[PDB]
Write a protein that binds this DNA or RNA. Structure first.
Ligand SMILES: Nc1ncnc2c1ncn2[C@@H]1O[C@H](COP(=O)(O)OP(=O)(O)OC[C@H]2O[C@@H]3OP(=O)(O)O[C@@H]3[C@@H]2O)[C@@H](O)[C@H]1O
Ligand SMILES: Nc1ncnc2c1ncn2[C@@H]1O[C@H](COP(=O)(O)OP(=O)(O)OC[C@H]2O[C@@H]3OP(=O)(O)O[C@@H]3[C@@H]2O)[C@@H](O)[C@H]1O
Lengths: 176, 177
DNA sequence: AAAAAAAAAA
DNA sequence: AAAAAAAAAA
């Protein structure tokens, strides 16, 4: 389950054309074609097995609309997402290795290779995300009203994941 | 064939002889019989006569055979004790390097990097061809050899034209072209 | 003239 | 949650 969901993230977010799949402007690909692509590496994968990963994913990583499937965030190619805006959250969190602090405190959170900067409404998931890149990880606290007043709307892309264009430095209130 | 074996011989004698189960002495020498068997793990058709042909015909004097022992004469990334003669004849020496290294070289000077010694040449072509290994935009550095000797950095005759030195201070670099 | 296995950033 | 064959700095 974890292995296929990882390769599903690589296909839907980064290199769908590597498997001969062309996503539409919303990032959607046909579920039938992705199953055949997943079968190129793991032949035992079925459409039901794919619907299990989407239905049970603890982050709401994937979305199925009719006969199409997409990753809801994490893209490195630009897509057109229709997620609802988050006007509720007061604070948002981002985990990052300690080495990135001088540049983040100066330039703010940039999207890097992804289309959007990714933050979370949860401290654990934010810190867990940052641990993917290093050992000494710090928790960044982001004033969500600071972002809105500066014209950077936050969108509800996952259960707790939130995407935003970028985070200016003075919207980071605390590093722990 | 000849260029492929000579390349692998450069990797064993200069960089990782332990990977092939070879322990060099303090001069960098390895038994010629043991190196032949090491080259046979990759290229089974290599014989001692083939190896001796590479040493005798190498256009840079890369390798030295003393009795039953063989060594690379320079290029080492592990420290060795070389007995090469001192170069007291050369007035100028040459070093090729990519254009991007110039600001650092002009400030810190030529440093050995991963090798034991800085490598220069008495020949301009070989110096530029050495730098071409690292990039396209290569520049020719001119080195006053008296500047080096006066500053206590002796130059040694390691190859036909290759010369090894501890380091090259910046103000011994007279020209970059 | 520093070969080449095998692991995995962003 | 970016898989992964395969090539090659210094
Ligand atoms: N200005 C700046 N200078 C230097 N460095 C900066 C920077 N401004 C930002 N940085 C750092 O650059 C990294 C990019 O890495 P990148 O993978 O693009 O970003 P993230 O770690 O946010 O991951 C995304 C999603 O992917 C996971 O998978 P998922 O479980 O589906 O969700 C999770 C998660 O939401 C990151 O360390 C960030 O601080
Ligand atoms: N201060 C500084 N800053 C930045 N950069 C610097 C530097 N001070 C020096 N640098 C550059 O760092 C490179 C090291 O690369 P490295 O391969 O170690 O050096 P060389 O290119 O001199 O090659 C060795 C032998 O290897 C070939 O094989 P060979 O035919 O047997 O002989 C030939 C040759 O003598 C090099 O670009 C140098 O300028």
């Amino acid at each position: 389950r974890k292995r296929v969901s990882k390769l599903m993230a690589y296909i839907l977010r980064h290199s769908p054309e590597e498997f001969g799949l062309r996503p539409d402007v919303e990032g959607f690909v046909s579920l039938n074609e992705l199953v055949n692509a997943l079968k190129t590496v793991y032949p035992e994968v079925t459409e039901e097995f794919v619907r299990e990963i989407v239905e049970n994913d603890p982050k709401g990583r994937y979305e199925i609309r009719g006969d199409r499937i997409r990753a809801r965030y994490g893209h490195s190619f630009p897509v057109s997402l229709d997620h609802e805006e988050d006007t509720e959250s007061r604070f948002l969190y981002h985990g990052t290795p300690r080495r990135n602090l001088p540049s983040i405190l100066k330039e703010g959170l940039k999207p890097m290779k992804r289309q959007y900067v990714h933050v979370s409404t949860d401290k654990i998931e934010a810190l867990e995300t940052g641990r993917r890149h290093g050992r000494e990880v710090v928790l960044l606290v982001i004033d969500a009203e600071c972002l809105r007043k500066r014209g950077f709307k936050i969108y509800k892309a996952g259960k707790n994941v939130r995407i935003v264009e970028r985070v200016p430095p003075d919207c980071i209130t605390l590093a722990v």
